[PDB]
Structure 1
Amino acid sequence: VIQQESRLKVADNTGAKEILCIRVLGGSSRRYAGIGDVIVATVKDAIPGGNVKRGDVVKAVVVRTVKERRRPDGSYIKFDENAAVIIKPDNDPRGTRIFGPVGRELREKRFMKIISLAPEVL
């Protein structure tokens, strides 16, 4: 689970390689950010000469979480790194495709463009 000051790997080709959570949107004094949650972030590392720079304030949906996530069927799911995709203000990604697998909880949070670009959707 992701709160403020967590650093996340970035799972798309926007040039950003590592962001840093600031808020967890979705209410007042919200503490944790599961799969399918918008995050205000700050880009702490970036490839030289890209679309984004170091020091930008962007938004991002979380697609991978190390902490286990209960699903309604009784199953669980657990990734091995924390990953986010930078989004536009219409729930569309800034880049053009997604590296690594993404979770199925993006499907009820109406993020349909990120699932269709993903290699594998679990």
Structure 2
Amino acid sequence: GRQGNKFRVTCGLNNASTVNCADNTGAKTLTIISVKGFHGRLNRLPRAGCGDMVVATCKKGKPEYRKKMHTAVIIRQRRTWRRKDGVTLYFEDNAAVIVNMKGEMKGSAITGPVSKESADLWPKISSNAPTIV
């Protein structure tokens, strides 16, 4: 579902990392299980940066979302990362929205800003994104 390539973003989100769900789909927080497209190495933990599709579970939310595995996209992170034009930037919290494999967003709203890395990769997220930082 992703469109185009993504530059290097230093992945600051580990396995078993709890992130907020900025969506409106009754899921409060998600914990990362695996990262789609991650290439394994011995003893390494899966890593996710901005705009990275992940496989996550909801440990806090409505009964129709809790205790189930979902697919999420990382939209912001507290890990400092550098754009190719010499801009060093980082957000205030780690957050993600729930999207499916085709990329179409399940919800219809996003709270707070959205990184340009995630917005350009997934067009459906940018359409629902208030601001793109």
Tell me the TM-score normalized by structure 1: 0.90
For residues 58 and 119 of structure 2, what CA distance do their matches in structure 1 show? Answer: 26
Q: Indicate the residue corresponding to 2:71 in structure 1.
A: 59
- Please, which of 22, 44, 59 is the counterpart of residue 44 of structure 1? 59
Identity over aligned pairs, percent: 38
Pick 1 or 2: higher relative contact order, CA cutoff 8 A, min separation 6. Answer: 2
Alignment root-mean-square deviation, CA: 1.4
The residue identity in structure 2 corresponding to 1:19 is L
> Moved runs in structure 1, 4+ residues, more than 4 A?
none
Offset from partner CA, 1:66-118 (integer Å, 9 cap, x none): 01111010002210110000001211111011111100002442x00101111
Q: Distance in 2 between matches of 1:12 and 1:89?
A: 17
Give the length in aligned residue pairs. 118
- Partner SS for 1:106: helix
Stretches of structure 1 that go unaligned for 5 or more consecutive residues are: none
2:115 aligned to 97, 103, 108, which one? 103
Q: What TM-score comes out, normalization by structure 2 length?
A: 0.83
User: Unpaired runs of 5+ in structure 2?
Assistant: 1-11
Do residues 14 (structure 1) and 25 (structure 2) align?
yes
Note the C-alpha offset of 1:27: 2.9
Q: Residues of 1 paired with 2:126 and 2:111: CA distance?
A: 11
Residue 53 of structure 1 deviates from its aligned partner by 2.4
